């Protein structure tokens, strides 16, 4: 059973809809607001995560198309062939650059991404922190801290966290955080349509 | 089975029974087990001593085993399963018949048969004709029976080591490849 103020009904979805945009309101033709609280939370977090990934992908696409490559060597230290980020850039456009990336580099990147995914999904970590799983009444999008000294801390200390490593939010006001969440949802949708547009082009 | 003899210090101080046939065995079944153990012990000790004596350069008996057929002790080669093969079939039947008569005797003469009370492995005819062990204390006799069982278990492994050497060459180390 849900025990939080997280949205669990079409009324709350409509409230958040007018909050993010008074004009559109709730645009739900498929009627996936007519679902259980757990599914509503799942859809909320899915939207948020697509926003994160789409924004990151769009900014990466812009930087890679501009051609601001890295100055290092990507391989060739532990007795392997030498490949440079300049070579990766000269491979082609962003999809071609990803294709030109070596296979274990891809595997390690995807592994770190999955590590962050599971640190998000781990209910015990959120409850050691101040949250629960987004399906069972948790805030959609909260990343638990990777730096900690609790029993749920890594064997070796981690320096910083994923979100807010140096407190750029610092103390944003108790509701301007929600304002930024609204702006984030809108910008995530915009970046979603944008990145699919660039990929289609 | 805990009361019966055989538990020396070599297997803890307890009965050796992985499968647990003693658990199935009643008192008379344990009597059968001890009687069979003892008979295998004694036959094996005789067999291994004879094999060692014959095949370790010991003096073969003099004269002819069979004057009529010409078979001699020396003609019988000092090799396991060759001396027996070359022994006359009549002599083989003599040995087997004497053994069979003795075993029917040890079954019919003992009155409280090892199965119905009695003592397993007691054969009054053959033991100590000169009475060599007729004035030993009961403890000493128990110790000597324990020694009998321990020697015989080793003897029955040894006789099979000899047998499996002939039938499977190079089975046993520290033993000739042939026999």
């Amino acid at each position: 059973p849900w025990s939080s103020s997280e949205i669990k009904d079409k009324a709350g979805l409509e409230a958040l809809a007018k909050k993010l945009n008074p004009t559109v309101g709730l645009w739900d033709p498929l009627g996936i607001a007519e679902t259980s609280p757990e599914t509503i939370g799942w859809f909320r977090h899915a939207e948020i995560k697509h926003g994160r990934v789409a924004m990151a992908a769009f900014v990466g696409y812009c930087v890679q198309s501009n051609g601001i490559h890295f100055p290092w060597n990507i391989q060739g230290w532990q007795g392997t062939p030498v490949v440079s980020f300049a070579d990766i850039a000269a491979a082609g456009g962003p999809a071609d650059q990803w294709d030109a990336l070596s296979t274990p580099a891809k595997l390690q990147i995807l592994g770190v991404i999955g590590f962050l995914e599971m640190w998000s999904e781990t209910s015990v970590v959120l409850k050691a922190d101040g949250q629960e799983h987004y399906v069972r009444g948790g805030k959609p999008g909260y990343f638990p801290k990777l730096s900690r000294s609790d029993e749920m801390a890594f064997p070796h200390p981690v320096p910083l966290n994923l979100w807010d490593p140096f407190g750029f939010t610092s103390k944003m006001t108790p509701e301007r955080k929600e304002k930024a969440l609204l702006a984030e949802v809108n910008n995530g949708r915009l970046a979603m349509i944008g990145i699919f547009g660039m990929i289609s082009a | 089975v805990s009361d019966m003899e055989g538990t020396g210090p070599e297997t803890g101080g307890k009965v050796f029974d992985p499968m647990g046939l003693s658990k199935i065995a009643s008192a008379e079944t344990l009597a059968w087990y001890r009687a069979a153990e003892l008979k295998h012990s004694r036959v094996a000790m005789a067999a291994v001593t004879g094999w060692a004596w014959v095949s370790s350069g010991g003096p073969l008996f003099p004269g002819y085993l069979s004057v009529e057929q010409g078979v001699t002790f020396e003609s019988l080669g000092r090799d396991g399963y060759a001396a027996w093969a070359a022994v006359p079939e009549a002599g083989k039947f003599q040995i087997l018949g004497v053994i069979g008569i003795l075993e029917i005797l040890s079954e019919s003469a003992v009155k409280p048969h090892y199965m119905a009370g009695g003592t397993p492995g007691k054969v009054p005819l053959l033991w100590d004709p000169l009475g060599f062990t007729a004035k030993l204390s009961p403890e000493t006799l128990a110790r000597k029976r324990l020694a009998e069982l321990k020697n015989g278990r080793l003897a029955m492994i040894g006789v099979m080591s000899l047998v499996s050497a002939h039938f499977i060459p190079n089975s046993v180390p520290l033993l000739p490849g042939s026999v």
Binding site: P104, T122, V124, M152 | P9, G12, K14, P173, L174, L175
Partner: protein, 228 residues
Amino acid sequence: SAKADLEAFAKECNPVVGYWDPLGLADLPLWGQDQDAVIGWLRHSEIKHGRIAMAGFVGYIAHANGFRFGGIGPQNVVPEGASAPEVWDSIPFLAKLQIIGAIGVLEHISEDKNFLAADGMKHYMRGGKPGYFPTFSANVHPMPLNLFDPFKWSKNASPEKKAKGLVTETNNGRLAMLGLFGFLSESKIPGSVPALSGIIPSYDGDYMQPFLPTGPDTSLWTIGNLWA
């Protein structure tokens, strides 16, 4: 309850994950035995696998890189530069047999009621410590040194330290299991352990047949070699 103890042990092993029994093997009634006996068996299997895998990992580094005792012995028939899978294949057949048999004697002593009772302990499936190798205090002939802690470095160690050491033993044993089979898998399904690619050579031969190839039949004993 045994499952409660196992759950707490899992939290100690990793508190973020905790108890993770996806198959319910703790709940399953193996051999019809109760949950306590089943969990004792499963825990003992875990530590046994982990211990043997840790020793196997260190042995893989020893054999593959080249680490041999000098003088007469099994190491003199193994070709120099042989792979870790090839060392076992190249030692004599009797050497393989006596290694496995000595391990068998150790296992037998480990589960014997005699030694465990002389040490005032019980079998791990009947209310005992899962993973406890007893002292050789009933081996008919005295043995100088025991298997665990032969020099008795831990004769006065705190129970809390011993519990933490067992928690470490389980974790490192699991990790060593994964690494050792990483080595084995890289030699038969290449490109499966990405880091080990190019390091572990391919091995054509059944790992799980101990006696294939049977290895040489040499006689390495010199003085008193009447069995040859």
